[PDB]
Amino acid sequence: DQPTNHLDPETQSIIGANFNLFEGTIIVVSHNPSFVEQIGINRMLILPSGNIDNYSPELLEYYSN
């Protein structure tokens, strides 16, 4: 739940890069656009309108709407 919060910018990039290589399932919440890009999200679940969707730059479309 917001892992990069409170972390210095250098440590954030380290966190994102290492998670990307993690060989397991990751349920993540993050308002930091850079961190999610490094992890390489696969599916995004939108709230409050439940929408299990494939991850893409359409994330921006949901943010706008």
Binding site: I52, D53, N54, S56
Partner: protein, 153 residues
């Protein structure tokens, strides 16, 4: 082959849905010529879709195909010392081939215990424009768009 294009053998329609596409789906799921098992999986899965959804399963399957069948494919071309992909339009026969291959292949990899459950879930997800089969179509279009510089080929 070198001589030229060959005859494509026709398939007869499904007995209960009166759809050739349903027969083609049955063939794709079939293993070792065991068509009885293949047909049972497809018909059970269309009954699951008739339960999770109130719509005609044949309608849901066709909507899944619309979201999965690709339009542009990448055709590897070897030019000199550089081998790069060339975007290519997919002929309608291959479109259903890829759609059936992708829907079946990713259903086999799903997590549900039984194939008909796995197939029904994969079909319904594709009908809603989500899931692995749709992601395979998105990547295929993504690859063509990137290599769109080689369209003149």
């Amino acid at each position: 082959p070198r001589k030229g294009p060959v005859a494509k053998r026709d398939v007869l329609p499904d007995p209960i849905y009166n759809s050739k596409l349903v027969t083609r789906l049955i063939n794709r799921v079939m293993v070792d010529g065991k068509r009885g098992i293949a047909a049972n999986i497809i018909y059970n899965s269309f009954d699951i879709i008739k339960e999770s959804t109130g719509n005609d399963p044949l309608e849901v399957f066709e909507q899944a195909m619309k979201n999965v069948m690709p339009v542009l494919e990448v055709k590897a071309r070897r030019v000199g010392g550089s081998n790069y992909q060339v975007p290519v339009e997919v002929r309608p026969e291959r479109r259903t081939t890829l759609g059936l291959r992708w829907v079946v292949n990713y259903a086999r990899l799903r997590g549900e215990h039984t194939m008909e459950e796995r197939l029904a879930k994969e079909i319904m997800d594709a009908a809603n424009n989500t899931g692995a089969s749709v992601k395979k179509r998105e990547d295929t279009h993504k690859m063509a768009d990137a290599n769109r510089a080689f369209a003149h080929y």
